Amino acid sequence: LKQISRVEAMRLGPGWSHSCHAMLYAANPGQLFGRIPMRFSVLMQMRFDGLLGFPGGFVDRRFWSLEDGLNRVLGLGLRLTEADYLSSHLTRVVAHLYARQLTLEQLHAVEISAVHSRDHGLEVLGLVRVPLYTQKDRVGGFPNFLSNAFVSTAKCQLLFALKVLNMMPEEKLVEALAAATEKQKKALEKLL
Amino acid sequence: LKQISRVEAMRLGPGWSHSCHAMLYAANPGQLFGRIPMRFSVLMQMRFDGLLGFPGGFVDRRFWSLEDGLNRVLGLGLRLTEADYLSSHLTRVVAHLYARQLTLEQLHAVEISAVHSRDHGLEVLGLVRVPLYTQKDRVGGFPNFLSNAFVSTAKCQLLFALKVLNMMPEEKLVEALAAATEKQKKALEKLL
Ligand SMILES: [Cl-]
Numbered sequence: 001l002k003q004i005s006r007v008e009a010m011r012l013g014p015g016w017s018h019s020c021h022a023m024l025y026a027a028n029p030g031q032l033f034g035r036i037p038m039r040f041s042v043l044m045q046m047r048f049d050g051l052l053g054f055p056g057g058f059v060d061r062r063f064w065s066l067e068d069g070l071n072r073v074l075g076l077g078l079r080l081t082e083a084d085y086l087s088s089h090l091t092r093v094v095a096h097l098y099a100r101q102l103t104l105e106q107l108h109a110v111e112i113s114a115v116h117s118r119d120h121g122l123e124v125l126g127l128v129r130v131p132l133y134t135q136k137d138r139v140g141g142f143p144n145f146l147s148n149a150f151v152s153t154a155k156c157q158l159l160f161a162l163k164v165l166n167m168m169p170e171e172k173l174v175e176a177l178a179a180a181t182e183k184q185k186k187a188l189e190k191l192l
Numbered sequence: 193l194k195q196i197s198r199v200e201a202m203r204l205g206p207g208w209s210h211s212c213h214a215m216l217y218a219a220n221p222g223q224l225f226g227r228i229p230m231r232f233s234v235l236m237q238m239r240f241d242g243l244l245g246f247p248g249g250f251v252d253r254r255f256w257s258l259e260d261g262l263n264r265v266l267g268l269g270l271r272l273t274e275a276d277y278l279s280s281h282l283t284r285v286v287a288h289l290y291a292r293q294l295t296l297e298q299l300h301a302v303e304i305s306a307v308h309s310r311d312h313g314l315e316v317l318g319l320v321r322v323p324l325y326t327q328k329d330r331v332g333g334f335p336n337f338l339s340n341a342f343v344s345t346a347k348c349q350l351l352f353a354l355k356v357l358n359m360m361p362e363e364k365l366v367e368a369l370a371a372a373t374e375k376q377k378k379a380l381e382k383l384l
Pocket residue numbers: 135136137
């Protein structure tokens with residue numbers, strides 16, 4: 001999945017569309033069932049098209065910079081800047097990823113704001129927290145989560161961000177994705 | 193997937209576990225992008241194990257009837273009865289399904305209550321609305337939704353309930369599931 005610099009992406013022809021998305025996350029000192037460390041909580045959402053993705057959407061560059069556009073397309077009813085920028089990937093779409101660490105209290109505030117948003121029940125069908133832990137059965141939690149259906153680029157963006165923000169070791173991300181994919185294969189083999 | 197009567201399920205040995213779940217839904221006169229009829233909204237949720245399911249959980253029959261247990265395990269921070277019962281299926285677990293039509297306003301109230309619940313961010317990671325429409329590309333909406341990962345029995349329960357409550361024609365449910373499964377197959381073929 002080709003990476004491109006923000007400033008080079010901005011020079012692409014008018015035939016290129018730009019999407020901007022935000023990964024909002026918080027340290028989570030919670031312990032599921034009092035024994036499984038949650039470590040972090042990340043917000044994703046169910047989109048109108050039945051896929052999981054990050055808050056955000058397409059930015060009309062006739063009106064807005066990437067950052068000004070981002071803040072207007074989050075749909076969370078709620079100021080991200082270049083300081084929050086992570087990377088851009090070619091998917092004729094360039095997908096721009098931003099990330100911001102909040103307190104867990106602030107992350108909950110976003111969830112509350114979201115349910116009261118104007119976009120709730122239209123383009124956004126509900127927020128979900130990503131489980132980053134893996135249960136003893138080696139599938140419950142993050143591997144199962146990664147076996148859901150994601151909008152183009154979002155799954156790759158999630159895994160990229162977890163790595164580069166030092167939220168999970170690369171080895172554990174590789175394992176979780178392998179477990180997810182094996183699960184999908186086995187499930188499809190039962191059906192076919 | 194074997195069906196069993198409620199009263200026969202109640203006679204099963206102590207080696208059988210019982211789960212009770214609720215499908216809360218409302219008529220939705222909304223039109224996505226002003227052209228796609230939404231028809232109904234149904235609530236599901238992201239569980240702690242990274243799978244989509246209905247609100248509910250295991251009922252300890254040493255303490256509660258199926259109905260008394262159901263109302264205590266919803267996790268929505270909020271009275272379902274035998275009148276709301278739909279069916280029971282053998283999955284060593286019997287999965288009991290209940291359903292209740294609310295106003296859209298009441299359905300939104302449940303979403304608000306849920307984000308403020310004691311279980312939010314523990315066993316429940318967020319509610320989502322099911323998109324029952326299909327976009328012009330024949331995958332956006334319900335087929336994509338059905339391509340997510342579901343906890344045992346939930347996907348079958350959803351499709352069963354949509355049929356028997358006359359919310360979607362059987363032909364359209366069959367089509368949506370076929371589209372979902374073909375999508376999963378094609379996606380897995382790209383990876384392998
Ligand atoms: Cl576990």
